[PDB]
Amino acid sequence: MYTVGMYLAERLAQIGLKHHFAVAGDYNLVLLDQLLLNKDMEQVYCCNELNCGFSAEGYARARGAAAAIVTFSVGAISAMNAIGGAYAENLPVILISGSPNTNDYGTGHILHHTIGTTDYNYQLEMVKHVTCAAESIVSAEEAPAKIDHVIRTALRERKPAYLEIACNVAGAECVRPGPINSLLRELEVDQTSVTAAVDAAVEWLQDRQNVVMLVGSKLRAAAAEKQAVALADRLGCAVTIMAAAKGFFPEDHPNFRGLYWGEVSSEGAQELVENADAILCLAPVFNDYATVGWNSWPKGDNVMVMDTDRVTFAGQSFEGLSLSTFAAALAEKAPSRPATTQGTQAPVLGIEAAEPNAPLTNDEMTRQIQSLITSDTTLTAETGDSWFNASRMPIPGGARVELEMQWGHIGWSVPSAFGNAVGSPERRHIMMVGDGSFQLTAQEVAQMIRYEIPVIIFLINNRGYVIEIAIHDGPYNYIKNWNYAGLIDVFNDEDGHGLGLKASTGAELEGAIKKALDNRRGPTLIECNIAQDDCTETLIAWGKRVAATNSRKPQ
Amino acid sequence: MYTVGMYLAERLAQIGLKHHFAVAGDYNLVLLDQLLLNKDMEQVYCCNELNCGFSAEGYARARGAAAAIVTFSVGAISAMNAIGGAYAENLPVILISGSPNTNDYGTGHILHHTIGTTDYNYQLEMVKHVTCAAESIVSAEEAPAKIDHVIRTALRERKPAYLEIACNVAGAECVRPGPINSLLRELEVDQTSVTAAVDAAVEWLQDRQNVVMLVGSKLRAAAAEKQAVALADRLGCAVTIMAAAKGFFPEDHPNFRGLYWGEVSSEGAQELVENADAILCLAPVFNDYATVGWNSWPKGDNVMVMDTDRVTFAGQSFEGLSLSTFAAALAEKAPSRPATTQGTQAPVLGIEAAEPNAPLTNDEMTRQIQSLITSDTTLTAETGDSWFNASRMPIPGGARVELEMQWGHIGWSVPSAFGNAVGSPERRHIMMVGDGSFQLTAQEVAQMIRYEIPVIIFLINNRGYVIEIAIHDGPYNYIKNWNYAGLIDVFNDEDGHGLGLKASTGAELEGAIKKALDNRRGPTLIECNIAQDDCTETLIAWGKRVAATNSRKPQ
Amino acid sequence: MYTVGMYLAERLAQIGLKHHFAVAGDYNLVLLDQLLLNKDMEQVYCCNELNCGFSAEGYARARGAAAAIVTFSVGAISAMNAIGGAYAENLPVILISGSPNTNDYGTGHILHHTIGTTDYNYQLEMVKHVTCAAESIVSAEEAPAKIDHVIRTALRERKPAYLEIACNVAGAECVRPGPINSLLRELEVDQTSVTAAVDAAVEWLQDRQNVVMLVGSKLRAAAAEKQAVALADRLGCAVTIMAAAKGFFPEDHPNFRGLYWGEVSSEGAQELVENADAILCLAPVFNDYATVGWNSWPKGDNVMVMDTDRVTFAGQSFEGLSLSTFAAALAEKAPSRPATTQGTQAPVLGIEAAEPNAPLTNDEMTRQIQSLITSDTTLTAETGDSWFNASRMPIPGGARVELEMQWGHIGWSVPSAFGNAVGSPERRHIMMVGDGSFQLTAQEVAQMIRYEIPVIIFLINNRGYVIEIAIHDGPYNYIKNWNYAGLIDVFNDEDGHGLGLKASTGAELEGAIKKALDNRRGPTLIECNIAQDDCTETLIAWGKRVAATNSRKPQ
Ligand SMILES: Cc1ncc(C[n+]2csc(CCOP(=O)(O)OP(=O)(O)O)c2C)c(N)n1
Ligand SMILES: Cc1ncc(C[n+]2csc(CCOP(=O)(O)OP(=O)(O)O)c2C)c(N)n1
Ligand SMILES: Cc1ncc(C[n+]2csc(CCOP(=O)(O)OP(=O)(O)O)c2C)c(N)n1
Ligand SMILES: [Mg+2]
Ligand SMILES: [Mg+2]
């Protein structure tokens, strides 16, 4: 007996998934059983569906795709928040939901876990707004076409997708999937467009001596990181990153000149980019946060925007190509433009160590975290002042930084780091999460414990929502303090090997970090006591610009 | 300076809210400031937006309405789950989201907390599927009409509604709201219909000696609890409840004859209902869980269905009336029909006290919890075996029992008990939650601690999803155990006055209950060690019927 | 045998429908049979579903409600345009669609008249955007509730609504509807609010001497025509209408002072409104066309806006009332304010009779049409220069003018007049329609002929889209000329009593009108030869303002 659920599981295995995330409910139990029969995947359980969804999202940052299985409505609607986040962050997460028995359609039956009307279609209609494809299976006959359609579309678009499978069809006899080379099939490229684009680009660079590359947060989605390097080596020009693009270009590189983020840029990088004769933007996302409230937005005659399927410059826009293909072809023909590398250098941390027994500062915490980042390290940085600490940390080549600056859902980091570490266990896994963020999703630390995932968690306990205080202060920014370190042994109970530690000084942090490195059978949470008043100066400047922009009057 | 947010606050206070629930975010901060200016309300903060929504939902069970305020997308989509919950359970919860600055509409700008496209309307489009009204405010001029339409429709339909307010409109100058008697305005009743319905009902009851009232879960939504009592008193007939209707009819009543729930009914009640010549159903919801998988569903010649706005019986349907006005009018003219009360008795708990040092049983735990329920007690019972324990407990008249049997989102109980206790602090608040459920929403116990809410939480630690085991067993039912009692110390830190206790015997439970009653400055969690095998026999019988119905094969 | 379709037919009869409109399709044939069994209604067939929908719309203008019955998708989507129009113009039209057999739900079957996917819900999801209620019926048991919900909501909201009925459920056995007084039940009014609103309104009028009523296009939707007269009688002030409100206030009232429409107002009416101390706006719609491109929009301190459910003035807004109840209560307490009636005059047509043999002018045509308008005449005026001719015609009390100025769908007038004449056959029915408009819907004249409906059609053959030429000229405004008068013979064939006549002079028009008045057994089309450049001066002035407003550059 080969079933619909096995077809799904076999295709998920062919994507490269070694795991999928689940929360059981009576609409998906038979489905979950079919997925357990597949030998190439482990079925990982989560506390709640918001966390399950974000676990899949993190797994997708490790493996290029992921799958989250939930129950109808009560499960799926919370997961839709994580799916919207996958869409925002350009990740192929597949959300599969159990759905009502086929015999209930066209009857007028009221069903459990619904709003209590005869419409069972509302979940599909809701989820279409946060997915690139969305299908519902009510027969075994139609399942192959729909399963494959959602997976193929997700992988090609780099966007999440949705399936629902009727609870009484997940175990129904289904045809077997045929063999494949890859489930990712790109669109065929138009060589006329690439050629005309390259030649136009070469002509445009002729009278432009000061050239800067600006790397954007869609570069990984374009699968063009290597072609970005190739291009950079032939131009020999300065390379900068947008905040959300950290780790998508090696900061090791001899021509790297730091972070462009308007008035909160690395030293020199603002005037570098803003005075350049040619700015080559590689897959940028110029949203209100990245532009510091619409103040720092490169555009005009001096800008070339290289999106994932398009390049635009000099009054022209060339389409039917990929960033991968255009960057590779332009690399062949690009002239030397080294001027912007001369009389500049890669930015440094600029934090000399603190007196080891003094109260722990933000700079000092940032310094020790930075020293932990190897070339086999993944650092997950939460929305909060962690964006601004992570943004000023130099990293070695091969190191991966995970940011969620488009969606910006606080608490993302805990289940994301869990999913990421499950998907790339060979790497060292670090995360920086604020106290506020941590409270939304804290319970997934228990699943890190259950599955023995050695994430090192730097909890910044600054007694509130500090980034919100820098935008607009009020009573809503002040939260109930927990003993975050002591939470670990509650989640351990009898079995677990999590470790909960405290650090109120440089010397205490140093010692906690040693014990964290040695703890291999579970996570280690280092509660860092940082003063509420002790945040980055970059956060305070950005926050003021964001507050002004959000509050600007109507017309 | 009178503002849009102030207009909203004033109307919310006019509904009778003394609290509203919020999670801050930059899209709603200015709105939160305006709501804070209102003298008649306190602003209660939550850990996450899912919990914030269920806290409002619990508050609405106490006060008849509630408000949750969230930020765009990252907040709102989680809260949509709880709003779907509010729809399912017929509760006027208003969800208010902060939304984008008016100046970004029609520009093409990409905004933080969005999926990254130019569509800002997608949240409104999603939330329409789980609300009775949903509006978007982008000007102070239109705000009054949209605020009032949302609030009025919610209250009248007994369904949740949605508002989004542009972050730069919340503090814009607005006209003042006029004085009101009540924002609940009902539809005019059609007396021609009432009269004909009553006259037809009297004629239908002429040759029907065995009459039984079956009280349903929409009776509170109909605002017809008193009229139900008047009708029972006049008929003098037997009165039963459906599982979801507990506390909507007084179990004190001399003519009460227990729970009707198919094969898992109280003693006698199945035979009583199913053999009656007339069954008067008052506001039923005959879903798949309530009918035990379509096996126990009263319909046909012997059945009268009284919906909130309609009566159906004897091949006729009468509308333009309300359950309240029809029940009253029928009580005036109803014949005496006492035959079903003669010789029978109201059902008894029937649990003998255990030996005080024997390992704690489900029965013994149920016995001690049942003794805590007074006429001023609210018992919130979670989806789990707590549904079946709660449904076999007799309660005194005036006792309130909260079940979420249509939506059935595990974890609902914790934030719902929180909001309900905040809304009715004069009452004693008891909570029955399973270990599995507790893990989804655990963190809101920290808000009970923050706001000093003396909920007594009976945590049933049976080491997994036991109700899911009764449907279909597999590895997905077994969760990571926590030290649930010890979690209270973590949430307390230095501030709090919550108490965490364990009970493994009848005597240990007794002492923990006594310390629970004496703790007025915070919640008391009592972790009860119940065996995984030791669940009610009703759960097992009901579980098998549900599995067989859910799994029935396609056509 | 009492069926679902009979329940529907009986509820439609109870609203006051003596007709419903249909286009047969295999999905609705059985439903159409059920409807035909109803003794109180005739079933009227239309050429196409756009026309069917607009025929219902016109019927609703006569009788307050209407019904159009169509087939799935191929029928319903065209009808949605008319439904959109009904929403725009505040008319309770019920669109009923046949839909798929219930056994196809949850199967994956591909069905005829669909887009060819397994989704059959897409029609319902589309129509929700242009309706106040939308329900799908897949069982006889649920049919009564859904039928009554859509009808009651439509009548109370004064908006259209949607039903779909499965093609195998329309003939299914149903319970019978109970007797009613009226299917229109209003919301109970809040006396506290009315009292405060009237008392603040009186106080506000006490301090303001020059008062002017401005009658708006939602006054009929408010059902407040008579209360408006009472208010005008107690106030004794000048009364003006907005263009779309023509006929909603009697123009031979001694205090009527004409049309307010910015710079295209009738003589003296612009100054009268714009220099007033108080402007009482009774149910206005201030769209871009009504305000002459936002140049003439009364607002601010001298303005009181009475909506259908709200009153707003002097920094306050009162709700929980109706325009009907509020204006009646204000009519008993308001002060006398006659100053704006003194000196001024009710405006006249001001067109001298042309020399009878001179080429027909726009003025001469307008003069002769104005003469036909009696107290029991209904004039349907199409989008085009007819808007501007109708708006400069004085009409006696009781006369009705139908304009579609919110939706503005050219061609609406032909099927609208047809439905209106079917619904109000005791009246004289006149139509003004342009050549361009007529071409979209000309075939419904054949239905006028079929059903012997004596509409007098004045077809203005100005050879193109003259209103669009005044906005912005180009080749898209010039259309193929037809022999419009000769079309009547084609539709007559050997059977009908339509008359088609040409008028190129005042004498020929006079002769044609006399023949039109004598033709009782069918419509009379009078094709009037009007020069392309002979359009009203008001159209030119208005056209320029609209063009400038639409083209205004982005920011
Ligand atoms: C789900 C969600 N809710 C609310 C917000 C709004 N928000 C953004 S940053 C922030 C504060 C984060 O606090 P913390 O985690 O303590 O970081 P800190 O700024 O203190 O370092 C909030 C409440 C959000 N982005 N996502
Ligand atoms: C959000 C959500 N996810 C999943 C489910 C499916 N579900 C129903 S009962 C249940 C088990 C609850 O277990 P517990 O709280 O331990 O109570 P017990 O049955 O053990 O008494 C689950 C996972 C649900 N109802 N809601
Ligand atoms: C369905 C539809 N299509 C197009 C338009 C745009 N439009 C508005 S007025 C008009 C011209 C109408 O021409 P005619 O009926 O001859 O009247 P005239 O302007 O000549 O008086 C057009 C095409 C519309 N309102 N509705
Ligand atoms: Mg913080
Ligand atoms: Mg359990």
Ligand SMILES: [Mg+2]
């Ligand atoms: Mg024309």
